[PDB]
Design a protein around this nucleic acid. Structure first.
Ligand code: NA
Length: 51
DNA sequence: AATTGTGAGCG
DNA sequence: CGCTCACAATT
């Protein structure tokens, strides 16, 4: 399956791969609508942890 | 001060 | 190349 990285969800959502990382781990500085976009994205793309 | 991006450092 | 961790320079 399509190896959906953080970079991929991040690009689609409207955020940097760092921020989508700090949704998962080192979680900090993912603000209201940007985090809503990642919560959207997590479903709209089927993210693969580590690849 | 608030986050991104740079860097750094492990995977 | 993939992800986490903390930090400062831009803003
Ligand atoms: Na992860």
């Amino acid at each position: 399956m399509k190896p959906v990285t953080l970079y991929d969800v991040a690009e689609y959502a409207g955020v940097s791969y760092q921020t989508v990382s700090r949704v998962v781990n080192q979680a900090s500085h993912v603000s209201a609508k940007t985090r809503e976009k990642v919560e959207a994205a997590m479903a709209e793309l089927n993210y693969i942890p580590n690849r």
